[PDB]
Amino acid sequence: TXXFXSG
Amino acid sequence: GITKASLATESFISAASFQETTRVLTEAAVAGKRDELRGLKENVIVGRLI
Amino acid sequence: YSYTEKKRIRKDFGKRPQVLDVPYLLSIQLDSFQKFIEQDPEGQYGLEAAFRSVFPIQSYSGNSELQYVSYRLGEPVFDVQECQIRGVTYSAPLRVKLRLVIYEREAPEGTVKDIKEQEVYMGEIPLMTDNGTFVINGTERVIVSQLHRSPGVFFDSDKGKTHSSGKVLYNARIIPYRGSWLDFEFDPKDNLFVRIDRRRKLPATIILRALNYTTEQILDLFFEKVIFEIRDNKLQMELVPERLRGETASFDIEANGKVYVEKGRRITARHIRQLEKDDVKLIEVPVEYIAGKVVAKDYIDESTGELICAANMELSLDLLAKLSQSGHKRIETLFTNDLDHGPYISETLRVDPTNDRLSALVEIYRMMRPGEPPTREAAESLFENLFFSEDRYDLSAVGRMKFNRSLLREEIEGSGILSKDDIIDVMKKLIDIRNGKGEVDDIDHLGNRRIRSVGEMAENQFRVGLVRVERAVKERLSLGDLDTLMPQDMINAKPISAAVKEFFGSSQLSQFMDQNNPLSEITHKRRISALGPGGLTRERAGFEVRDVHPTHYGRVCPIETPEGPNIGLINSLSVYAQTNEYGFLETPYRKVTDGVVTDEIHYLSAIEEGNYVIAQANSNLDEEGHFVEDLVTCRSKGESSLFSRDQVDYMDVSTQQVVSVGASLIPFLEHDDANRALMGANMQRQAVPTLRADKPLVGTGMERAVAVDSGVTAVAKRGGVVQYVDASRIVIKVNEDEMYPGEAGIDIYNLTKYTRSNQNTCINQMPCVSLGEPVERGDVLADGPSTDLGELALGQNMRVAFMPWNGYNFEDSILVSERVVQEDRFTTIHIQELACVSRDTKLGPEEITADIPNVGEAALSKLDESGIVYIGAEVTGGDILVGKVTPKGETQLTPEEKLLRAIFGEKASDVKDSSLRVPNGVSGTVIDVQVFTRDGVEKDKRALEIEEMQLKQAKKDLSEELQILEAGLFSRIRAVLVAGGVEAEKLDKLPRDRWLELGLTDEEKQNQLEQLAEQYDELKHEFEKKLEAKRRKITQGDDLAPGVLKIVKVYLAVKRRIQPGDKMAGRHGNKGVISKINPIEDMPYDENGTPVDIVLNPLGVPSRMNIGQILETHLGMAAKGIGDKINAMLKQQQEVAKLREFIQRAYDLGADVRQKVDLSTFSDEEVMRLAENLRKGMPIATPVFDGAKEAEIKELLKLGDLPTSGQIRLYDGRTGEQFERPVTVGYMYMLKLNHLVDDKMHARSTGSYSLVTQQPLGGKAQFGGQRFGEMEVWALEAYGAAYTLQEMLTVKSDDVNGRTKMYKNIVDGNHQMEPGMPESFNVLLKEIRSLGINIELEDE
Amino acid sequence: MGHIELASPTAHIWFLKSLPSRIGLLLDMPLRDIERVLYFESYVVIEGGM
Amino acid sequence: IETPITANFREGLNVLQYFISTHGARKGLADTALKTANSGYLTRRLVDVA
Amino acid sequence: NKLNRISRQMLQEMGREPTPEELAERMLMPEDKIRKVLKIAKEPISMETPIGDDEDSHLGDFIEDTTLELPLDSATTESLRAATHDVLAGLTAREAKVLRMR
Amino acid sequence: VPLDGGRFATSDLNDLYRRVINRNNRLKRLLDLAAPDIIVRNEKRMLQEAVDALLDNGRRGRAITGSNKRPLKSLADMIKKRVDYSGRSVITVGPYLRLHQCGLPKKMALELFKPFIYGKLELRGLATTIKAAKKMVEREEAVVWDILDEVIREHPVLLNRAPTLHRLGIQAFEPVLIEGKAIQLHPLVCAAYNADFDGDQMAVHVPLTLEAQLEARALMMSTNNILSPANGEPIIVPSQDVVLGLYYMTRDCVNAKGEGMVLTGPKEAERLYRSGLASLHARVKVRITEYEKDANGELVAKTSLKDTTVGRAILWMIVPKGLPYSIVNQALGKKAISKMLNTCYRILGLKPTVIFADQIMYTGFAYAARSGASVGIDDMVIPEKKHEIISEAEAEVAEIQEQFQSGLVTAGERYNKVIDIWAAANDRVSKAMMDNLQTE
Ligand SMILES: [Mg+2]
């Protein structure tokens, strides 16, 4: 997803 | 550690300007201490040239 | 919508069909306050409930009774506009009918005879306006709804565990609406403790003792019983085989001559089943087996009467021997284990230091009220008042509901107070949880979190004030004559008014209204916060509360939240969400039966929602028909799962339901990163209204509804025809369609014009209609600020190119064309308010006068007789707005000045110049002056001219209303008079006032004429007294503060043009400051010579990952072309053939496989009218998550004539050489934010200083000084810059001698002056001396 | 700076309430006893010499 | 989560995927905002000690 | 205190705050609106009164020092003295002495 | 003190003192009147409490309060800077600036420098005296400006942005007076301030004394602090567009259009490059003499003709003058540009390296603009492989589902295998994306 597994 | 070391310093103007002002000032006043203005904080407070 | 809303609808471009329209946006406010005010509802909430709680007020003498009959609210003394003008709260008077009743007759049971009844005035309560806002002391305010865990019962545990962490502890908590918390919790030894009012832990059983439960009763409450029998001098146990499960036999388990389990054998399911089958209910046991157990009741030797053992005693060989010896044949013991039936309570009794009810009550009292010993009565009273008296403790209806649902009560109705059964049941559930039967529950779930809207909070403070008023009453009953008392004498309303005024004025949830643009206020009203009274402090607030919970879906927007500290604490209601009566947020879903999706919608709470399987809104349908997918994507519980159509109970209404109103307005949102989307959402709120504002070429389809629900735009109530259109007003004649108006006709809408908002932006409405135009119900009449033809206009559509430009767009900076300033794009109108007061001084009166000491006529030129600048004058920084003289504190001048004055012979004056001047960096045109002078003060031309003007305006306001009313009613009585008694050329002769004398043949029509004749006089008389009321307040009142002679307010208007340092942003989170304004010839341009408006750096795109701005640009390129193409058609040989082309095209975006909606044909004239408006700028709707998709955009680009990519050859305006690659250029929608260099830029040399600290201080004309903090000092230290630092610490701050010497030295040219210890250090030294410690400066 | 002449002596609070009390430490008096004497709760016998 | 997000920002993603994201996004912004405050504290400790 | 009691009474029955004139009527003879207005003196307010600013600002911090003169003034006075001396140097000693004495 | 309204405002210490004095006086009066011991005891204890409250409020017992809502401020509370000649404004990029310069708004400068301006206007005949000078300057009468220009000559101001995390949060710059209300900041220093132009503001300070000014010009100048005190690496270094420009001009290409040209030296090569037939560099050998070998001042290379690019040739012209011809023509990189700047710093010295940094900035921006770099929706290139990989992942997942319902593997094992499969698939599609862009 992006940052933080987000993103 | 850095906290305990920070709290360690002898000069009372510096210490009292850090934290725990009342405690520092009572112990200092009791002991009849003299600040030689060796460090930066003391002089900054004084308005002196560091 | 008339002319199809002038047919600018364009295309929806998304195939999802919304079964329901968006609910009223402001409803969370409007409905809440409507509920709060009520009309004697006899229903929950709304001051009625408060009165019900406070009354009847008991005697405290066994004779008095003050009771409440009903309340009423009067009409507001002053209208909203007036309230804003005079700094007065907009409110209605509250009255209450109360009857003081003697309480029964002496020795005659009940029902005394004499009652004194009166209606008492309780003061005023603030009214909510139409748009959901309040007017408090002149300023518009919004009350933000509050989110909280709320009252109820909660069962939780600790994830942290012991310090070791190798443990698990369970807890329970009862939170009431009013009163002390009640907590229960296990310790690591499995003992149970209670907290009252969050105080220190007490062993739990104390409360049971306080209830009146003996030790025996407690044990009976908490333990299932194992019964033992003594007989044949042997010991037996009444066997329940289940209880043997998981154990090994410690003795031969046998019955009826059969050994079922040999000693040392593990007891199996089969053994238990064998015992059960043979109905074995009694087996022999050894004494050691019983010695382990805890006895359930006291046993005495029933011969001697002496106690053998007490309840909860652990049995022993001795006690068993004694029990056997005494002749007892039954022994009741506790059934416990180390898993699912833990004793806990038994050990708790051991740690409990109390032994009975009285000692428990005493211990509780000591805990509550330490330092004194209580009487029995005091302890009993305190305990009763803790949880068992509704005047001191109330769960509330919602709290009782939650409690009852949690504890599995059949009904949600119940008492506000706790029962002993409630407490017992909570303890039992907690013990069950510890035992492992059942589990805890989570509190952050939106089923356990509810909203307190305006009504609930207002009612809260009202209830508090009411309670204080009751205190005052109860006191007043005892004092004075007890025989002669009216309710008026008994009631003082001051506490209630104080509580309410305090709530609306000083509360944290009461906020200065945000009105920067319509979307700002719209969003502000739908605000929700976890802060405020009864909420988180931000130290309380950790990750858990700020997180986006799964249950936020359809309820709270996951996108729109503040950036920074308040993140997750402040949020926004989802678009389709509603807050129910209990205060839970509900979201709509469509019922699905079989594979068929009904059009019936159920609003579901989160707890309600958790039961079903809910399919996504984008799931395909064959129409009805039935669900068209074999496998559907659905939601149930936390988990998201794929499901068969048969298993689908409900389905989402729209994609829109997830996101807030702000988030909705972001096109291609599905292509934009959430963090950046957050910024876009939040930043749309900050968009400043521009004079030339246009609706975006790329819209989401929400921009009309936002303009509609915020009351800035003016709409038609019913179908009708426009009679008059003006800059000032619009007159609409109703009854054109369906003839709805009856018994008089027409309506006049005055328009707000060049009003000043809270943030100094200008709010004005402009007419969107023309005389004789046909309008339907809900049709747009006037556009408000930042709105275009009923669509939301927060910015402008500009032609943008994405490419680096000479470093001027470096790091998000933005470059613009001078043409934007040329055409006044992004120019914003602003009105500032300045104010001056002239007050009584000890030295004599301050006066507002045109006569000011030592001022030229040049300076005084724009001032009238009074001293106040005249309307229309241009004022620039330093110019005088209001002239004022103040008495001098006075002093003789220095002898040199004596000489100077003598040489130039000016002669000094008693007064000093105090006039209000225009601050630096400000200026404009004076558009208003307001002057208020003390009542009965000497009034001059100042308060006479403006007054006379207001009288002329009011009188004209009556002549226009009587004109519209006359030509509104007589034009209706004429069509009635003609019918039957036709008099064409005869009626248009005699005066209009004679048309009433003419009767008509006996018929029901005559009654119509008669009614119109009564309504004419009635309404007219109401407008006449309406003028009177205006001719009263103007010539009396204003109510000024003590000491103040007069107040003058000057409204100056300023127009601000976009400049370097101003901040622009788009809806996708792309923001930047203007760094360069380069002339048109330097701008990159298309081959046909068109220069671009904005150059944005592409480097801002890839890291931010907000794709949408690009798509918006591409579509915006397409749109840029099509309207232009239409323009060309409009230019030459315009024919309906062009309409054929347009209908072809919209129905072509539709012709592309999926079509959202279709529209075609219609009248040629309507097509022509619509054609110009849509031609100038084509519009577009691209809904959230069901949007325009690439291929369709490519198609429009094809009609646009392409490039399909959206890139075009671009020429460098400096050279003429083309940029070496194709560059995307398209129309982007960009807003100018409220952050402007004009406001922010300030500087100071020297200026005003503070009294005590002597540090530089921000004056009214002197800007003040920046803070040089610890870290900056560190910065200077690391540079080893000693003299710079010393300058910061002395000459440039608090040293009077140092700064004076520095200034003088500088104007004479010099080196740094001698330092002096900073005045704040001398202050510190002197303050330490006052502390009594000797501080001594010492020499070397 | 000015001054107030007290009719009865008053113990400085910093040297009493700050822990451990400086007065208390000097006079070998626990916080409770110093509290009791200073605030008039009980009398503390002094200099008996027999 | 068992199921991934098949979509890429060019294509665009289903509403569920986005919602399930917002959490991560929010955790991120909150992280950075708290982070400035904590980092400042560390810096001050080190300054006080050195 | 009498004024306060009567204002409270009037607010109880009339249904609104009294004017200065009404309070003066109710007070008795020797009281008029002017005396009622003058009479309203109010206890001082704490300099340490909290203000809802970003960093816990105290009311006192917003109050300028009107007593100590601004530095530019000092400069101005110095320059005035100097120009006065320069001018007193030009005219004859007698006519300069007359001015200095006067 | 009397506030603006005429109302009175007092420090709480006055009230505390008042309680103290009241109780003390009353004690004296009670002693003189021979009061019983209970009353004198009460009074004495009250006095102790009042002194307590005066010294520290709240230390012993309930803190004294003016009203219940607020407690009184004692001396202890009292015990436990803002500056002149300072300003602030919104910052905007100033590409044309030299590293040691900043854009300073005219009005701000007029206010900040006002006393100096008065002095100088008195020295010159522009005004009779300082007062006349002030009265004149507010008018803004012409020649005041030119005077202000004369005032700030050689003078430097401090720029600061909060938060000041390290000493480069404050740096000294020579002010260039500019129209407009925005402060203009040099792009190379944005990194050190962590500043960007999305609405950040900066504060300006004026060092007054010769001593302070010398400190600023020697110790604090941006151009004198080119490298991090933390890592020793360059702090002020090319970022974003600059790199983009340089990389664009220094890129390998088939170069079919401009190949095969002898440069006749950097100068002729430059002419031709601007001219025609050279775009986005070319695969052509340049004649430029290179050299600058060190361990000797002589330098010089007899022959220096090497395969190169028009941008690459251009770079040598841009005053490198410190060897590393090899380093040039290796194509530009942000890391590579930082390393180039650093190496230039070490070998060629500080002042000259500063000049090099300015040149690299200028050229970088210049080419960055004309490159035509942009972003369209088609510039994000999907890989045909994606659908394939997704179908594969679906098939493997079905195989794991079947293998699960058989009961061969635990729920946990299944979950782990699904997660692993998907991780690997994500890696695959990443690789496919990068491969699709990478080759052409
Ligand atoms: Mg920034």
Author numbering:
A (entry chain M): 2 to 8
B (entry chain D): 1308 to 1357
C (entry chain C): 3 to 1342
D (entry chain D): 102 to 151
E (entry chain D): 755 to 804
F (entry chain F): 461 to 562
G (entry chain D): 253 to 332, 345 to 704
The article reads:
The structure shows unambiguous experimental electron density for Sal in the genetically-defined Sal target, confirming the hypothesis that the genetically-defined Sal target represents the binding site for Sal on RNAP. The structural information shows that Sal binds within the RNAP bridge-helix cap, making direct interactions with the BH-HN, the fork loop, and the link region. Sal makes direct interactions with all five residues at which substitutions conferring high-level (≥128-fold) Sal-resistance are obtained (β′ residues Arg738, Ala779, and Gly782, and β residues Asp675 and Asn677). Sal residue 9 is at the end of the pocket that opens onto the RNAP secondary channel and the active-center i+1 nucleotide binding site. The crystal structure of the RNAP-Sal complex also defines effects of Sal on RNAP conformation. In the crystal structure of the RNAP-Sal complex, the RNAP trigger loop is disordered.
Salinamide A (Sal; SalA) and salinamide B (SalB) are structurally related bicyclic depsipeptide antibiotics, each consisting of seven amino acids and two non-amino-acid residues. We propose that Sal allosterically inhibits nucleotide addition by interacting with and stabilizing the open (unbent) state of the BH-HN.
